[PDB]
Amino acid sequence: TVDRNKEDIDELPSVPPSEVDQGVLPRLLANLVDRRREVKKVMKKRVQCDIRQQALKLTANSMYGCLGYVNSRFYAKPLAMLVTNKGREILMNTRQLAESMNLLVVYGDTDSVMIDTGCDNYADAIKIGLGFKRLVNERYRLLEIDIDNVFKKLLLHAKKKYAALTVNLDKNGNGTTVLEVKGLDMKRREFCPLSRDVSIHVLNTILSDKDPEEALQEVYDYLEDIRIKVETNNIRIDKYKINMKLSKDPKAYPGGKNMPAVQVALRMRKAGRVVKAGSVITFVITKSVAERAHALNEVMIKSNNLIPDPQYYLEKQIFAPVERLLERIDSFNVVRLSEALGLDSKKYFRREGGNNNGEDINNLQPLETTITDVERFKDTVTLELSCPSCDKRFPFGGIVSSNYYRVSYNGLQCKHCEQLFTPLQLTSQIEHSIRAHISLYYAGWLQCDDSTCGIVTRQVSVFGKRCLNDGCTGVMRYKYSDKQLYNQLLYFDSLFDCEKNKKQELKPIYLPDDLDYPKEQLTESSIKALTEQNRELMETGRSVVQKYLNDC
């Protein structure tokens, strides 16, 4: 169904229109979705059927994945490009729709959004969620969105890593909480079960409804209790295991003298164990790091008399994971955490403040760069744009909030008519504004310094700076100074520079009292994602300005 350029696999086709008959791929995928839905209706034996439904989901996902496998007999790179393109588009539209209803999206990941409902109860947020679902499902015939989980408290550590308290309803309207984690140092196999258990206890304590400082004190008490237990070796060895699977043969690792699992695998191979590529290496650091790592089975032998090193664990397996866990938590004293775990507090003191700056008089700083861009572009006028379709005129202000244009994932969009600016329809307007300003500059209007004369003319005397009024002593100067025109061109350049837009260093286009003041302000993550998604359009709009900045 999709017409594509077979001479260049990197060129992206467009969606085939409605009149083309449903094809082969959508039909097969619909059948597979029906099968998995029937399996889920069977769910509603349970664990075995869950294996069944996740296998069917994996089959459905592979039906898309092999559109990106090079050695697949049905390799179609443009297809996978287009599916990912549309997926990102729907994520962008969903987030923008969320902002349209004054809703706080706190995260999103490739098919999902997380919305802070501002509610202290379950049903209050559920009503908003159902309204959101109804509003979004109307946009698509077969795409449908649905509530997956409800989190009473959400802790976002970083990208792909977060922990939450899932609200699970019961038969008789009863609601229970369950700790759900994704991608953290807990869920890893490189981290010991001891780290897992203590981190589970820490998150259970923080996300529970207790006084924040009291929560931190309880966590600290737990922490030095574990410190004493680890130091005295009063813990069963089994909780010390570290798992790391080697993708390559332990002979083919160049810097394997540092990573310990390679040494453990070499010792196992010498001892008479079969270790190859893809094998999982389990080991324990005993008392360099790699030279003190030995397998569990060797360590479980009391005849060896191997005691795990409390120092390495108490630093890296425990302190760093908890420090990462509570980084964004209010009044998190990392120094107190290290003191509870007995680590050097000077190593952590430089992370809170970034250490002392340190500098002499650095005169490598031209006064051209030291001038703030805000004062440079203060004496400028905004760019004006006309929509090619609805002919509405709006001031463009970069990738920023406005009542007239949206920087959609595909490109610049008008709010009034929802049409998409082609790159030419924006570059031509940019060039028109630039040339109009240049022609006004070359109009050669002259202005007199004197305040009681102030006359503006295009007449110049053979004495250029002499005012043409009888006896006027004022200094005659150009009305459109080339400094002002350079400022305006630099403003047009800044409006299309990705870096400035991402740091939000663009001059606001509306004063707070303006009736056209944007009612919904873009989030920083949104601006970063958009400026990365429209990099080509921004760079072309900047190159148009650079056409006239190089000559100036």
Binding site: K346, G358, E359, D360, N363, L364, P366, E368, D482
Partner: protein
């Protein structure tokens, strides 16, 4: 003007590797290159001025500034871009520094000294080529006066070119050419008697004459540029840059003596600990390295002598040059932003992390056990009452007070700086 004409005019302008900066440059360069080149030459010139204000020797000065040549304004290169960098930077600074007489004096002094250096690393063939590019005497006239000229210039050759052997001096004199000039232009050499003087003419020590002529011509051109500046006051681009650049202006202790008892007797306890740990382990760790290096810099150890001492204490040269030479030169502020780092005082030393096993930095009055400190005091012939006194001072956290007590018993009372300790100990012997 075309690119070919510009290249030809430039090759004519730099037929010699050095230039007198007579004809202003022709061409168009961006504001980026303008500001960058002006800043580069101003940095080199500020470094020459800082060296002058410390009364450093000429040889030391070129040793410091040769890498700055390789970095900022590389010389002795066939690249046209570098030569134009030099020319436009000189004329840009000419524009910037002509506003006041003091600025003109500073600029001409620094530029003439830079000319002296640049003529110094230029080779004798290249020096002859530049000088030829002030009348040279013929071969017969040199032969007639060969004995007197050789007598006049023998001492100068020996003391400047280090030609201690007489045969080398004679060979250099045979190839050396001379210029016939009157004594009124060479009076400074006439007073010192570095030039043979006959019939009112002085036979040229040519670098001094060249530098004096450079200074005179440069001052005249600076005055002329100041006259022409009001016409160039009309441009908005250059004026802020010129204003910014104008405001931008505004051994007894050697590698072997620090090992000797005479100098080590004036050390404090901490520096003795660092020195002894260095001797035992032939290597010191980062905080100890910086502490000892900054103390040695404070007591007057030169950068070259510090490098020799640090290299000999670390008994390969490859890893040394790779990893420690830059640190030991950067402590002296010769690279980066060139920070002449102040030696750590006792508060800075006590603010550093506490030393561990193998770490020798810090304060012994804080980091050592009372037993080890007491033994070190018995090694200094301190009586038991004195030991109890310094231990009482240490127990209260007054480590500086304990060090001051140790100074007084072993030899404005309070000492809060190891370099102050060393200086007062040296004064007590002076």
């Amino acid at each position: 003007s075309s690119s070919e004409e510009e290249k030809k005019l430039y090759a004519r302008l730099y037929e010699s590797k050095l230039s007198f900066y007579d004809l202003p440059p022709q061409g168009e360069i961006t504001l980026e290159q303008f500001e960058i080149w002006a800043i580069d030459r101003l940095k080199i010139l500020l470094e020459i001025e800082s060296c002058l204000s410390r009364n450093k020797s000429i040889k030391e000065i070129e040793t410091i500034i040769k890498p700055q040549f390789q970095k900022l304004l590389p010389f002795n290169t066939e690249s046209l871009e570098d030569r134009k960098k030099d020319y436009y930077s000189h004329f840009i600074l000419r524009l910037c520094f002509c506003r006041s007489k003091e600025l003109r004096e500073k600029f001409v002094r620094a530029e003439t000294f830079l000319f002296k250096i640049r003529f110094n690393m230029l080779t004798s063939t290249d020096q002859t080529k530049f000088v030829q590019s002030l009348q040279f005497i013929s071969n017969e006239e040199k032969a007639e006066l060969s004995h007197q000229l050789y007598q006049t210039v023998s001492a100068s050759l020996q003391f400047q070119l280090n030609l201690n052997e007489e045969h080398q001096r004679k060979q250099y004199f045979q190839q050396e050419k001379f210029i016939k000039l009157p004594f009124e232009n060479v009076i400074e050499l006439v007073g010192n008697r570095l030039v043979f003087l006959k019939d009112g003419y002085a036979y040229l020590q040519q670098l001094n004459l060249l530098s004096n002529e450079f200074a005179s011509k440069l001052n005249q051109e600076l005055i002329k540029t100041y006259q022409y500046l009001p016409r160039l006051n009309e441009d908005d681009r250059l004026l802020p840059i010129l204003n910014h650049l104008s405001s931008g202006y505004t051994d007894e202790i050697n590698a072997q003596s620090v090992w000797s008892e005479e100098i080590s007797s004036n050390y404090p306890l901490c520096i003795k600990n660092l020195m002894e740990g260095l001797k035992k382990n032939h290597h010191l760790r980062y905080y100890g390295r910086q502490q000892l290096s900054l103390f040695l810099k404070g007591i007057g150890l030169s950068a070259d002598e510090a490098l020799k001492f640090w290299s000999e204490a670390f008994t390969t040269m490859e890893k040394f040059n790779k990893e420690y030479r830059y640190s030991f030169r950067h402590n002296y502020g010769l690279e980066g932003n060139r920070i002449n780092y102040k030696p750590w005082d006792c508060h800075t030393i006590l603010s550093k992390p506490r030393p561990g096993r193998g770490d020798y930095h810090g304060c012994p009055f804080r980091d050592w056990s009372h037993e080890r400190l007491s033994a070190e005091l018995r090694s200094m012939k301190l009586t038991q009452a004195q030991i109890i006194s310094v231990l009482d001072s240490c127990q209260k956290g007054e480590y500086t007070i304990a060090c001051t007590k140790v100074f007084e018993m072993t030899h404005q009372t309070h000492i809060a700086h190891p370099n102050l300790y060393f200086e007062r100990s040296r004064q007590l012997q002076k």
